[PDB]
Amino acid sequence: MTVDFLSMVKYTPLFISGLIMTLKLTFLAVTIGVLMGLFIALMKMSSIKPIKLVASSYIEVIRGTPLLVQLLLIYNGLMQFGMNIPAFTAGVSALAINSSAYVAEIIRAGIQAVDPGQNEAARSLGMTHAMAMRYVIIPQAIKNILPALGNEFIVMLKESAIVSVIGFADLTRQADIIQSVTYRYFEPYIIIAAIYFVMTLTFSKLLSLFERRLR
Amino acid sequence: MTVDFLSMVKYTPLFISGLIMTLKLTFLAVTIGVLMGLFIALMKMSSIKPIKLVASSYIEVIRGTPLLVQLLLIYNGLMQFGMNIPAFTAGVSALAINSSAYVAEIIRAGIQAVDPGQNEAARSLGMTHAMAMRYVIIPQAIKNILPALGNEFIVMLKESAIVSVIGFADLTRQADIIQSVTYRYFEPYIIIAAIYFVMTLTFSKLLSLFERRL
Amino acid sequence: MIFVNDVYKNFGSLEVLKGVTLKVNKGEVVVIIGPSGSGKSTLLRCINLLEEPTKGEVFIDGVKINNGKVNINKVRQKVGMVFQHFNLFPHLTAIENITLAPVKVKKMNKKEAEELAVDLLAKVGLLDKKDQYPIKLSGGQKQRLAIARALAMQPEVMLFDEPTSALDPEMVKEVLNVMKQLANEGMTMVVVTHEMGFAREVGDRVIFMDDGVIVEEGTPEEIFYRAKNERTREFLSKIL
Amino acid sequence: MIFVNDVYKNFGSLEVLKGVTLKVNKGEVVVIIGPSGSGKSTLLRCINLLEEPTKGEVFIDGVKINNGKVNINKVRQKVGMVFQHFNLFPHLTAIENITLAPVKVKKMNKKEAEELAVDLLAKVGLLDKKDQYPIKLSGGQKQRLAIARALAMQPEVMLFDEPTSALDPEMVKEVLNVMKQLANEGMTMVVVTHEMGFAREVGDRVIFMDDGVIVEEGTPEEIFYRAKNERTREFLSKIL
Ligand SMILES: Nc1ncnc2c1ncn2[C@@H]1O[C@H](COP(=O)(O)OP(=O)(O)OP(=O)(O)O)[C@@H](O)[C@H]1O
Ligand SMILES: Nc1ncnc2c1ncn2[C@@H]1O[C@H](COP(=O)(O)OP(=O)(O)OP(=O)(O)O)[C@@H](O)[C@H]1O
Ligand SMILES: NC(=[NH2+])NCCC[C@H](N)C(=O)O
Ligand SMILES: NC(=[NH2+])NCCC[C@H](N)C(=O)O
Ligand SMILES: [Mg+2]
Ligand SMILES: [Mg+2]
């Protein structure tokens, strides 16, 4: 018809509920994606060729391949095996895996980014690779890593909107729900985009602010 | 049932048709996103405060907000205005817009990446900002920008899978089609992943090589 | 010709110049020395307005250049600058580096520009490198090319911001010599340097700066052999 | 004590060391000089195996250390290294920087380590900085701290890779002095430097390298006044 944002007001509980769900989804995935990611990174550092090969292949394949395809592969692709996994666990799984790959890379690069002189001094003072790692390199790598993790989360908020297509009731899914009762798609989409934007800004502000204290 | 990849073979033309469609979608989207993107960057360089403000707001909103939501905003959100834009024009528009913001940032950053000494020397020799830009800075900025454009395209290939949800016959949509006739989702999805992967590798090699050449 | 008048410069909370005054006339070679972070390069860079004073004014040829009421390009045409890190244009050949500005700024005829350039290349001993790109040059060669480039605009004063400090030790003399030759030809020069030999040999006047202020100045022999001030003697005792 | 035997080093297509041999006995102060890119620092770094020879061997205390048939950490316990760019551990305080290796490598008791550290800090004139962080120290103070740290492992030889090249001029002497003190105390030293004064004052031997080879060596006065070889002469003439 013509635009009516006031009609949208009454749907606030749906928007807020969608938001909380986007939060819940992204947090859990990213959290799991980190623990997995750390584990994947450790594997890629193994001298044992098979393990490093598997970590590299995992990482490469996951980053080199669309998140959507991974989502559907878990959700639709598993049905024919007598699997009926809920939308939530599908989204969480897919996002956590995707994130695990990107996080693994983040760790490798946070380590590669500490000046190689540090390792040189550590070793020159008689320290083994292990000791140099524990007392010198890893503590600094960590300060490289934390801000890029914080950034991963922000990116994953936007990314998680994709579990809407699987019918999970995130912030994006709301626009379907609402339109079913209003026949209006435009206004709730604008509102949802706006919520995504404000979230992005909020967390971005925090993170950089966090980075400066850190450094 | 249990996995059967050989059954999948006869469906080769569908994968190929989908693949070709992802390419055409992505080439056209990025291409438009670049031309648009160059224009947006130029605006943000304008001294006229309103225009820089508009370009800044545009960039910020688009990058801080999900591509999906933009797609649906165009496709679904416009229907109620008596609009029935195809899945294709919707997808191309969404992708070109998203890409335009990211490219504007790439450009700004490729310029910011040339050592400030170059500009200082240019001006110190009497050259105006315009002359320093045309003869010294821009030629170097470009060499910064091209590899990141090349990388933008590669990212957009993966991104473009998202127009499948809008019913566009891309590489990802095929898995629906095939399963409607096979009841198999897994195998066509694996095959699709393989194809995205090989595309990504191929283009990564090629760009990197071109990069190695600059 | 050059008149920096009681300037101050701050980068944020960092106070770099704290009331500095410098006058230089045609033909002088003025050399600025002092401990690191004392503000030497910042003063130098105020003269051609690559830095803008927070207060104070800079006049060239008697006209104020930091009041926004002047064409700064015409000003920088007269006031050349040679940079610690060369700032050669990497996509341009040696001659092209040299001829770019005369052709584009002065609108010189191209054959003429090419001839100017070959003269300058010949002078700084780089003629056989005219079609080479900066990448292929050593540090010494790069700085000599940069000097040629600045000379091509025929400025009335040359500013040198520590032109040999990024050079390897085997490479310093060849740049300093070119500088000396310019001094011997009457070129007006303001040089910031860590090479005290240059100040001794060709400086007409040596300025000693400490903590954002000029604390002592005089002829080379005054500063290096008869310095009145305590800070000057101290700095020199650590350096010489 | 140290025997580098006909070593070669290449980084890809770049040939850096092209057959170099160096012997140093207990108590010598050997100084390596030469034009940039001649391989000085790479030779230096072959001694404690921070670089691995492509060919040739290095023996310390008569045992070969580049055949993988040795505990390399224990080797590096004996051979200290001082870096051009300090390589201080930023997250560790001064004392902590010093005591880190003895406690974790030698398993020294923490009070013993702390006492060692305060002796070394007093020695290099940094006692009032014991609890400070590297970011608060000047270049001179940083390099003196790094030296304290290396000494804390009580090595039998100290390697210095251009330890003042990144220092401001007013800051060189204080580091050189510490080095000289070590030389006067019989410490075995291999120093790559651009500061010829150090070689003059306490060097036992000067090694001149050019294009990946040792082209001439001798005592400091032999090299600085009576250099036989043309390359040595050329280099010294651009340098002295
Ligand atoms: N454009 C800038 N923005 C912020 N800080 C700056 C800028 N230019 C210089 N500084 C800082 O101001 C201080 C003064 O530097 P300057 O180079 O003028 O001192 P200097 O006496 O020439 O030192 P040196 O002999 O080490 O070159 C330095 O700490 C420098 O890092
Ligand atoms: N680990 C490395 N990887 C790649 N290249 C290296 C490495 N170490 C040294 N090089 C290169 O090998 C060459 C030899 O450098 P080296 O430092 O041995 O010479 P140098 O005589 O110490 O020169 P300078 O006096 O300028 O330090 C240099 O060009 C350097 O860039
Ligand atoms: N964890 C991440 N940052 N993932 C980024 C995903 C990028 C893109 N949307 C894709 O699916 O390939
Ligand atoms: N042109 C781009 N690179 N876009 C990246 C999009 C990232 C993410 N999938 C989003 O929609 O927010
Ligand atoms: Mg300076
Ligand atoms: Mg070196």
What's the token pair of residue C109? Answer: 């005829």
Spatial separation of the C-alpha atoms in residues B43 and B59, rounded to whole Å: 11
* Residues constituting chain A: 215
Ligand 6: centre distance to CA C82 (Å): 26
Within 6 A (CB) of ligand 1 lie: C 11, 14, 16, 34, 36-42, 162; D 168
How are beta strands D29-33 and D188-192 bridged, if at all?
parallel
- CA–chain centroid gap for D129, Å, is 24
Residue D34 near ligand 2, beta carbon < 6 Å: yes
H/E stretch holding A53 reads: helix A49-63
Architecture of the domain whose range is B1-214? Orthogonal Bundle (1.10)
The answer to whether C and B touch (≥3 CB pairs < 8 Å) is: yes
Burial level of D71, CB count in 10 A (0-12/13-18/19+)?
A: exposed
Q: How far apart, in whole angstroms, are the C-alpha atoms of residue C208 and residue C228?
A: 11
The CATH number of the domain holding residue C80 is 3.40.50.300
**CB–CB of A186 and B80 under 8 A?**
yes
- Show residues of chain C in contact with D238, CB under 8 Å: 169-174
Q: Is D142 in the pocket of ligand 2 (CB under 6 A)?
A: no
Tokens found for residue C34: 């002092």
C11 marked as part of a ligand binding site: yes
C100 vs B135: CB contact, 8 Å cut-off?
A: yes
CA triple B44-B49-B53, angle to 5 deg: 55
D138-to-C201, D120, D123, D135, D205 alpha-carbon distances in Å: 31, 18, 17, 8, 31
Say which DSSP state C136 is in.
Answer: G
Residues contributing to the annotated binding site of D for Mg(2+):
41, 162
Fold designation for A1-215: MetI-like fold (1.10.3720)
In angstroms, what is the C-alpha Rg of chain D? 18
Question: Are the beta carbons of C28 and C188 closer than 8 angstroms?
Answer: yes
DSSP B46: -
Q: Is C164 annotated as a binding residue?
A: no
Annotated binding site of D for ATP: 11, 36-42, 51, 194
Using CB distances shorter than 6 Å, the residues near ligand 3 are A 66-67, 98-99, 102, 152, 155-156, 159; B 158-159
- Which positions in chain D touch A135 (Cβ < 8 Å)? 100, 104
Query: Which residues, other chains included, contact C153 with Cβ-Cβ below 8 Å and sequence gap of 6+?
Result: B125, B126, C77, C80, C101, C102, C105, C106
CB distance B91 to B25 below 8 Å: yes
Interchain touch B–D (≥3 Cβ pairs closer than 8 Å): no
**Separation of alpha carbons A134 and A114, rounded Å:** 14
Q: Which numbered ligand comes closest to the C-alpha of D50?
A: 2
Question: CB-side exposure of D144: number of CA atoms within 13 Å?
Answer: 25
Q: Atom 10 (ligand 4): residue with closest C-alpha?
A: B66
List Cβ neighbours of D94 (8 Å cut-off, separation of 6 or more): D121, D126, D129, D130, D131, D132, D133, D134, D137, D145
Is C36–D194 a contact, with Cβ atoms under 8 angstroms apart?
no
Q: Is the CB of D39 under 6 A from ligand 2?
A: yes
Q: Which residues line ligand 4 (CB under 6 A)?
A: A 158-159; B 66-67, 98-99, 102, 152, 155-156, 159
- Domain extent, residue C76, equals 1-240
- Residues on A contacting D at a C-beta cutoff of 8 Å: 115, 117-118, 120-128, 131, 135-136, 139-140
Resolution to one decimal, Å: 2.5
Inter-helix orientation angle C139-151/C172-184, to 10°: 20
Q: Given ligand 2 and candidates D9, D15, D31, D36, which is best to mutate, with the most ligand atoms within 8 Å of its CB?
A: D36
Q: B152 by DSSP, 3-state: which?
A: helix
> Count of domains in chain C?
1
